[PDB]
Amino acid sequence: MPDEEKLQKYLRKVTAELQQARRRLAAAESQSQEPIAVLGIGCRFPGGV
Amino acid sequence: KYLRKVTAELQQARRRLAAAESQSQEPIAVLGIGCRFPGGV
What we know:
Chain A has one helix at 3-28.
C-alpha cells in the first residue's frame, strides 16, 4: 500500500545515481582509450592492384 | 506503472563500465563448465 511509492522513489533515485556514475566514468576513465594509427598498408586485389 | 525495466537495463549498462575495474584487473568467475573427454567423461 504505502510501500509501492517508496519502491518508485528507490527506482528513480537509484537510476539518477547510476546515471551520475556513468557521466563520471564514461569521460574520466574512457579518455584512457586512445586512437590507433594505421602506420602502413600492403594489399593485393583484382585487376592487378 | 514503474521504472523497473529501465532501471534494470541501466544497471546492466553501468556494469559494462568495467574498464574502470580493469585499471588493475577485474577477476573473472567461471560460472559453469560442460565437457566431453576420453574414457566416458
